Swiss-Prot record:
The chain holds residues 40 to 377 of 405 of the full protein. The gene is cid1. This is Terminal uridylyltransferase cid1. Changing residue 243 to A: Impairs binding to RNA. Also impairs binding to RNA. Mg(2+) binds at residues 62, 64. Changing residue 278 to A: Reduces capacity for binding RNAs. It comes from Schizosaccharomyces pombe (strain 972 / ATCC 24843) (Fission yeast). Disulfide bonds: none annotated. Cytoplasmic uridylyltransferase that mediates the terminal uridylation of mRNAs with short poly(A) tails such as such as act1, hcn1 and urg1 mRNAs, hence facilitating global mRNA decay. Uridylates the 3' ends of actin mRNAs upon S-phase arrest. Also has a weak poly(A) polymerase (PAP) activity. Residue His-282 is responsible for the specificity for UTP. Involved in cell cycle arrest where in association with crb2/rhp9 and chk1 it inhibits unscheduled mitosis. The lineage of its organism: Eukaryota, Fungi, Dikarya, Ascomycota, Taphrinomycotina. UTP binds at residues 51, 129, 132-133, 154, 158, 172-173, 282. ATP binds at residue 286.
Length: 323
């Protein structure tokens, strides 16, 4: 069945998704930050990537921006100028540089009225993140069930304290890939095809990596999987609870059958292995510790048990209760 659970899922979905109102304030915030960039560099562009761009944002969403420019112009100099304009415009934040990568972290806004806790990260020529976001955007457009599924999983993972990359668990991006991987390579019939392995896929190389995938989305047949949202979620919790073998396997988008061992990859951290679809050298689950993985797995199991439970009524609410 899953009829009541599905109904419940859409109810929570409508409560947790970014309201149209907040979306518009974030968009106005973007226009403001672009005006400040025009004052410093007329030829640079400021693009949004990540969850706001792909439509996978919860309420109180952070903003992820990227500055594009001529590669022959050094990003640290324009970054510092952009930072000084932002301070002068009444934004508060930090300017930092890990290795050769400059980053601005905006933490507040004191004048333009976008919040006392306005959070916004700004990178420089982070072209790979843009492409990651193009991929997720295209899937989101491809099946309407992806968006609610992702948000519910994100919301679940926050409530269970298993969404902390700094404390031994997994990033939200990591959970998006686990979902997508399930929808492409596990569920039968598949919900989505692998756009990177499409025969129609055209190679496009950016910063050393191949970011090509099939984006002629209107030519793709709709899914032959008719599962309800509730059923997809249960399938997803079931798979990572009982079927997926984190000790030996890699979540991957580069194999026709989704099979990849850690040994082929040389991934002896790699407690949990998720191969970024484009940046294949990057293990998205590298933040996941031993105890972190134990808790992630246990929560997957507990979510399965709950949806499989025989005691009626099933306390669906306890899926989003704090651990
Ligand atoms: N977190 C994360 N993001 C990456 C990574 N590599 C590229 N990115 C890009 O950076 C974006 C950061 O998005 P997140 O902050 O993880 O997603 P989010 O919805 O804002 O996270 P929450 O607000 O906690 O729900 C992703 O959407 C990717 O496009 C990575 O290794 N980890
Ligand atoms: Mg983010």
């Amino acid at each position: 069945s899953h009829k009541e659970f599905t109904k419940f899922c859409y109810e929570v979905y409508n409560e947790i998704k970014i309201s149209d109102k907040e979306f518009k304030e974030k968009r106005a915030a973007l226009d403001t930050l672009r005006l400040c960039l025009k004052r410093i560099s007329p030829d640079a562009e400021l693009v949004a990537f990540g969850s706001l761009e792909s439509g996978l944002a919860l309420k109180n969403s952070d903003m992820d921006l990227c500055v594009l420019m001529d590669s022959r112009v050094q990003s640290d100099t324009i970054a510092l100028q952009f930072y000084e304009e932002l301070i002068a415009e009444g934004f508060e934040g930090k300017f930092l540089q890990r290795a050769r990568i400059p980053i601005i972290k905006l933490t507040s806004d004191t004048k333009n009225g976008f919040g006392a806790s306005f959070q916004c990260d700004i990178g420089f020529n982070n072209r790979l993140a843009i492409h990651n976001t193009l991929l997720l955007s295209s899937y989101t457009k491809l099946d309407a069930r992806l968006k609610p599924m992702v948000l519910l999983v994100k919301h679940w993972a926050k409530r269970k304290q298993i969404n902390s990359p700094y404390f031994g668990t997994l990033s939200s991006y990591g959970y998006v890939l686990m979902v997508l991987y399930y929808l492409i390579h596990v569920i039968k019939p598949p919900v989505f095809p692998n756009l990177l392995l499409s025969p129609l896929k055209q190679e496009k190389i950016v910063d050393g990596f191949d970011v090509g995938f099939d984006d002629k989305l209107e030519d793709i047949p709709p899914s032959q999987n008719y599962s309800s949202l509730g059923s997809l979620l249960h399938g997803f919790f079931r798979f990572y609870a009982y079927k997926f073998e984190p000790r030996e396997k890699v979540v991957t988008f580069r194999r026709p059958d989704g099979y990849l061992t850690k040994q082929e990859k040389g991934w002896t951290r790699y407690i949990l292995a998720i191969e970024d679809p484009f940046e294949i050298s990057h293990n998205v689950g590298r933040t996941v510790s031993s105890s972190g993985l134990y808790r992630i797995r246990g929560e997957f199991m507990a979510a399965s048990r709950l949806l499989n439970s025989r005691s009626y009524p099933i306390p669906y609410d306890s899926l989003f209760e704090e651990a």
